[PDB]
């Protein structure tokens, strides 16, 4: 008998979620999720978005998710190279700017912001729950 | 084969923890925990305190926990009748005042405060994990 999620994670649906312990740039945020056998948050449904908006509703912190694009002309992609489903959220923030390390997306107050990937935010990691 | 804790709870050691979805007075907070076969947070150990302090470090909100006293001459007690373990935390704020519904403790980041039990706050529920 194994638990769906490790201690100190939140079990929701098929996944486990964990908030970072600090504020880091997007690349370091990505590395920390990978070291927990996880990835940065990927929002694939409105149900995913509702859950995360409630989970962060207690916090005014910015939280990186796994969404990035090299520059404004490029499409938004998750870490796995899959595209952003367009119906889920509008991206605010630095949507017209170009940065050397690219543009990355965070959620704050339930809304989604584009910013320079080298700047530091909290992050959310997710991984598959053990439901065998 | 059952999970230690339901969806939307956090499993930590022998317990499950839930952050309330609503902000209510302490009595109504307690009834919402009871409806989930749970009770208001009890901090039993320095390990429990470390865990809760890290869990709420994202939030500036007060969270009600299971600590109260009917009036300032009474001791602070958890809902189970047990006293506050020495050298865990100091209770700050107006510990001296008398309120119609009594005085209750909330935890906020690195501190615990006394407050009028009728004021509305988010709360933390716990219950035993299935192990």
């Amino acid at each position: 008998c194994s638990a769906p999620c490790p201690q100190d994670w939140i079990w929701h649906g098929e996944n486990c979620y964990l908030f970072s312990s600090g504020s880091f740039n997007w690349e370091k945020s990505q590395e920390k999720c990978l070291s927990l056998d996880a990835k940065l948050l990927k929002i694939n449904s409105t149900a995913d978005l509702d859950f995360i908006q409630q989970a962060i509703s207690y916090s005014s912190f910015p939280f990186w998710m796994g969404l990035s694009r090299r520059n404004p002309s490029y499409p938004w992609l998750w870490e796995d190279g899959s595209p952003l489903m367009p119906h889920l959220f509008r991206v605010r923030g630095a949507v017209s700017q170009t940065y050397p390390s690219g543009t990355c997306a965070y959620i704050q107050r339930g809304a989604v912001y584009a910013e320079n990937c080298i700047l530091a935010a909290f992050s959310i990691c997710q991984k598959k729950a053990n439901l065998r | 084969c059952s999970a230690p804790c339901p969806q939307d709870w956090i499993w930590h050691g022998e317990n499950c923890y839930l952050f309330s979805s609503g902000s209510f007075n302490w009595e109504k907070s307690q009834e919402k925990c009871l409806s989930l076969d749970a009770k208001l947070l009890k901090i039993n150990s320095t390990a429990d305190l470390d865990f809760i302090q890290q869990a709420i470090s994202y939030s500036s909100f007060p969270f009600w926990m299971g600590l109260s006293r009917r009036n300032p001459s009474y001791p602070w007690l958890w809902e189970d009748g047990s006293p506050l373990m020495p050298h865990l935390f100091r209770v700050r704020g107006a510990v001296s005042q008398t309120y119609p519904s009594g005085t209750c403790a909330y935890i906020q980041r690195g501190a615990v405060y006394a407050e009028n039990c009728i004021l509305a706050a988010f709360s933390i529920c716990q219950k035993k994990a299935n192990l």
Partner: antibody
Framework: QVQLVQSGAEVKKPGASVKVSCKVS????????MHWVRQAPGKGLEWMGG????????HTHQKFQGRVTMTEDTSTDTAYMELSSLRSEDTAVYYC??????????????????????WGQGTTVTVSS | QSVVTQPPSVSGAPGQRVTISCTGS?????????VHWYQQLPGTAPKLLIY???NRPSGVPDRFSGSKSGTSASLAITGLQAEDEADYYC???????????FGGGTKLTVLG
């Protein structure tokens, strides 16, 4: 660690304009969120304008629009506030203030959390004829 | 309701505790924006006292604290001393105005 030094006191006639300077030392202004705040004598703080991470633009309070211009000189690390059509009610201490909470390392959206920790010394503008 | 309001005056004796309420709306404190508090001693520039509802910057002592609840936030000062006599401003951001808003200010008198 960052300091803001403002230009000296000014006396102006109704109808004139004033331009207050705010020089940043210790870090580069292009990475930093500048605000302007004023306080008339015996009255409260009034936010005039500043950087908004919502859309990455400078906003001014509706109450001023037309009359306030905020500019930055990336070469001297100097911010400017210019207030035109001056009235007696504009007699006030003008303050520049900056959000230094993440020391240029945090996403700009941290601005809403950290507030204005670094303040210029203020500039007295007297509007009298 | 794109304003935040504060009472104009609060009073306490040295060693006592007082609170100052910042009352906002669904467009500022209730929209997920945090409250900051600024302390202005007689004849000085304002200084940041509390940020993000409850955080103390370096050199602000433990006896200032703050909290947020719904559309309001509160400043608490225990152990009042004479050097705390000052004007206190709350501040939030309002997404209906797309700008920052100060409360009217609260004069704190330490009864002498």
């Amino acid at each position: 660690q960052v300091q803001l030094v403002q230009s000296g006191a000014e006396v102006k006639k109704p109808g004139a304009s004033v331009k207050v300077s705010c020089k940043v030392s210790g870090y580069t202004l292009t990475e930093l969120s500048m605000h302007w705040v004023r306080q008339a004598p015996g009255k409260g703080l009034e936010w005039m304008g500043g950087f908004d991470p919502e859309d990455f633009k400078y906003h001014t309070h509706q109450k001023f629009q037309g009359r306030v211009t905020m500019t930055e000189d990336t070469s001297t690390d100097t911010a400017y506030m210019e207030l035109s059509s001056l009235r007696s009610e504009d007699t006030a201490v003008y303050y520049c203030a900056l959000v230094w909470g993440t020391q240029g390392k945090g996403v700009r959206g941290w601005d809403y959390y950290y507030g204005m920790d670094v303040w210029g010394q203020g500039t007295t503008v007297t509007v009298s004829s | 309701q794109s304003v935040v309001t504060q009472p104009p005056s609060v009073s306490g004796a040295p060693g006592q505790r007082v609170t100052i309420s910042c009352t906002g709306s669904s467009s500022n404190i209730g929209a997920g924006y945090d409250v900051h508090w600024y302390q202005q001693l007689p004849g000085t520039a304002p200084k940041l006292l509390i940020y993000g509802n409850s955080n103390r910057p370096s050199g602000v002592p433990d006896r200032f604290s703050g909290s947020k609840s719904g559309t309001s936030a509160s400043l608490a000062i225990t152990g009042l001393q004479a050097e705390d006599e000052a004007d206190y401003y709350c501040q939030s951001y309002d997404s209906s105005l797309s700008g920052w808003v100060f409360g009217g200010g609260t004069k704190l008198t330490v009864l002498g």
